[PDB]
Amino acid sequence: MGASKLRAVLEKLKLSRDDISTAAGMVKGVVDHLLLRLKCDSAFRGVGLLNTGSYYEHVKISAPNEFDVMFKLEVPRIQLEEYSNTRAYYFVKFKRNPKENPLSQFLEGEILSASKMLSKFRKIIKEEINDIKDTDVIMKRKRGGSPAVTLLISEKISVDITLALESKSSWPASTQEGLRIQNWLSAKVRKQLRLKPFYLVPKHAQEETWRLSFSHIEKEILNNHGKSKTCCENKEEKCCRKDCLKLMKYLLEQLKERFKDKKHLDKFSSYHVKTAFFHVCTQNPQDSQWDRKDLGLCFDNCVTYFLQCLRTEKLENYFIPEFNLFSSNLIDKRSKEFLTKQIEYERNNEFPVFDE
């Protein structure tokens, strides 16, 4: 009745795999066509798809009508400038003059404008959809932000397109003490990953700032998650790390759905639960600590960690330690206290929100 209740939840989540894989092929077709149009613009010359996120991390449990798409764009010779003491928000400057780089049209005086660039990006996708008489793909006129472009394929699939800059540079100094995988995935692996580029997605806190993004590293360490190189590659090594992340994601989803009226949980996201999960992985580096037989025990440790972040109002970004995702400024004290009472109730009543 214990971990077997959770096993039955995970079995129910497999039924939606065929509907999610069908709808992912719908999005890929649309996104691949938009990528060809974006490649025609000399500003979006180096544009490419970044195959990161829940679907590619094999943790896309539910919401077959909701997808998130990422688009990279190589920005060579970059110059960063930390916005205030927000260790994740930066200003994008250029190491060499405007004639050299093609993004020069979006420069708002030595500083790249995220609003000037996202408006061009939106304008291209909009005219591409308008030119094509297909009544299936429709762009929704949103409030702003990033993903600033949100599409609706076949009047059902909502897609969230995000634009990101790729910097093949050394990661910013704010990430110096982040990614604590040395005793789990190894010091060799941490060195290897830190040589890979980092991304910058437009996000305010000055409106012309960009937040650091490591969606690729998150995918890389989720699909190679064990200390043993052969983890989940055979019957004797099937761990429950991904099952736990799936269950934490589903716990937040169902709680958000249950309280979609008194909206306290709308500030919470599947990224908060993913970030907390990576911290639980750092606390439990052995594959012994993630046995398939101990699913109940492992999921309970994931819930307890998340409860501690809500109670202490502290959830560090896995890559930028000084960036507190649960800071009083990003999420208020009352929303965190409300979620704490709901997770405490769920944990105490054998999780009724999962049940049929």
Q: Could you say whether residue 232 binds Zn ion (CB under 5 A)? A: yes
Quick one: which segment of 24-32, 205-213, 225-233, 301-309 binds Zn ion (CB under 5 A)? 225-233
Distance of closest approach, residue 226 Cβ to Zn ion, in angstroms? 4
- The contacts of residue 252 (CB under 8 Å, 6+ apart) are 265, 268, 269, 270, 272, 273
Q: Is 21 among the annotated ligand-binding positions?
A: no
Q: Select 141 or 229, whichever has its Cβ closest to Zn ion.
A: 229
The runs of H, that is alpha helices, within 63-151 are 114-131
Distance of closest approach, residue 228 Cβ to Zn ion, in angstroms? 8
- Buried b / exposed e over 189-199, threshold 16 CB at 10 Å, is bbeebbeebbb
Q: Could you say whether residue 315 binds Zn ion (CB under 5 A)? A: no
Q: Is 154 among the annotated ligand-binding positions?
A: no
Quick one: which segment of 112-120, 160-168, 188-196, 219-227 binds Zn ion (CB under 5 A)? 219-227
Q: Select 176 or 230, whichever has its Cβ closest to Zn ion.
A: 230
Quick one: which segment of 125-133, 196-204, 224-232, 251-259 binds Zn ion (CB under 5 A)? 224-232
Distance of closest approach, residue 181 Cβ to Zn ion, in angstroms? 15
Q: Could you say whether residue 61 binds Zn ion (CB under 5 A)? A: no
Determine the residue type at 99: K
If phi > 0 it is left, if psi is from -120 to 50 it is alpha, else beta; for residue 100 that is alpha
End-to-end CA distance of the chain: 15
Cβ pair 38, 47 in contact under 8 A: yes
Cis amide bond preceding 76, omega within 30? no
Question: CA geometry: angle at 77 spanning 72 and 81, to 5°?
Answer: 90
Q: Could you say whether residue 298 binds Zn ion (CB under 5 A)? A: no
Q: Could you say whether residue 231 binds Zn ion (CB under 5 A)? A: yes
Cβ pair 209, 93 in contact under 8 A: no
Q: Is 201 among the annotated ligand-binding positions?
A: no
Among 53, 147, 172, 226, interactor with Zn ion by CB under 5 A: 226
Site string (235-274) toward Zn ion, x via CB under 5 A: ----x-----------------------------------
Cβ pair 281, 265 in contact under 8 A: no
Tokens representing residue 27 in the block: 């999005």
Last residue before each gap in the chain (C to N over 2.5 A): 205
Q: Which residues of this protein are in contact with Zn ion, per CB under 5 A?
A: 226, 231-232, 239
Binding residues for 2',3'-cGAMP: 68, 160, 203, 211
User: Known binding site: residues?
Assistant: 52, 54, 66-68, 160, 203, 211-218, 225, 231-232, 239, 249, 270-274
Report the binding-site residues for ATP: 54, 66-68, 215-218, 249, 270-274
